[PDB]
């Protein structure tokens, strides 16, 4: 089973972006990670995953933030980005077309 408890993740932008994409941000629905680039800084941390909700970046609350102000935050976070993430597959799947959550907590797209 995948821990559902919140976690703190420090990513290092360094050369390129943060290596991941987000969705949501409409009506305080939240901001979720929908894709992680292989070899990117997010992947390199090996702590994040698709389905994770960004609760905050460098302390700035982002739960009820919008995709645009979340993008702005992440982009301003700097070289050393600290992220508070929480696995929410069910809440994430309603965002991805033809996606669902199997009985192991994993997100599946038929």
DSSP letters along 19-32, please?
Answer: SEEEEE-STT--EE
Which tokens go with 93?
A: 């799947």
> How many Å apart are CA 12 and CA 82, to the nearest integer?
9
Helix (H) or strand (E) holding 12: strand 7-12
- Let me know: does 96 contact 89? Beta carbons within 8 Å: no
Q: Domain residue spans in the chain?
A: 1-110
- Resolution number, Å: 2.3
- Let me know: does 92 contact 22? Beta carbons within 8 Å: no
Place of tokens 């960004």: 54
- Let me know: does 86 contact 43? Beta carbons within 8 Å: no
Angle value at C-alpha 54, between 3 and 5, nearest 5 degrees: 20
> How many Å apart are CA 67 and CA 70, to the nearest integer?
5
Question: What is the CATH architecture of 1-110?
Answer: Roll (2.30)
> How many Å apart are CA 67 and CA 65, to the nearest integer?
7
Residue 8: phi and psi, rounded to 5, are: -105, 130
């Amino acid at each position: 089973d995948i821990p559902r408890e919140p976690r703190r993740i420090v990513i290092h932008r360094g050369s390129t972006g943060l290596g991941f994409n987000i969705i949501g941000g409409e009506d305080g629905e939240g901001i979720f990670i929908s894709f992680i680039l292989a070899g990117g800084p997010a992947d390199l941390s090996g702590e994040l995953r698709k389905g994770d909700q960004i609760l905050s970046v460098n302390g700035v609350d982002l739960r009820n933030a919008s995709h645009e102000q979340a993008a702005i935050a992440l982009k301003n976070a700097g070289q050393t980005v600290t992220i508070i993430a929480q696995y929410k597959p069910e809440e994430y799947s309603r965002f991805e077309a033809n996606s669902r959550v199997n009985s192991s907590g994993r997100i599946v797209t038929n």
